[PDB]
Each structure stands twice: as C-alpha cells, then as structure tokens.
Amino acid sequence: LRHAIEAVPSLNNPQTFSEQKLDEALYHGAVLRVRPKAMTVAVIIAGLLP
User: Which family does it belong to?
Assistant: First the structure.
C-alpha cells in the first residue's frame, strides 16, 4: 500500500481539496495487488489445517 501511495499521488495534495486521486492510489495498491495477501493467507491456513 505504501509503495502504491508513494509512486503516483505525491503531487496533488499540495493543492488543497484534492482527494479524488488519493483514493485511486489506495485502489491501485490495496485491491489490484490482492493476490499476494490471499496466497499468503491460504498457504498459512493450509500448512496448519492438517
């Protein structure tokens, strides 16, 4: 999420009342990159269920 918010959106906030592109950065890191977290959780639970 931090890499996401770091790449693009460090330019629009200096202009006050700018939150539209701040949410797109969270979308880019929080839900586009959701395969790694799901994979980690799945393997963690699967290596313990037995």
Answer: Belongs to the resistance-nodulation-cell division (RND) (TC 2.A.6) family.
Token reading at 18: 């700018």
User: Position 49: which residue type?
Assistant: L
Q: Residue 4: CB partners within 8 Å, gap ≥ 6? A: 25, 26, 28, 29, 30, 33
Q: For residue 6, give Cα distances in angstroms to 3, 22, 32, 36.
A: 5, 11, 15, 19
Helix residue ranges per DSSP H, 1-48? 2-7, 20-26, 35-46
Provide the resolution (angstroms): 2.8
Give the other-Cβ count within 10 Å of 8's Cβ. Answer: 14
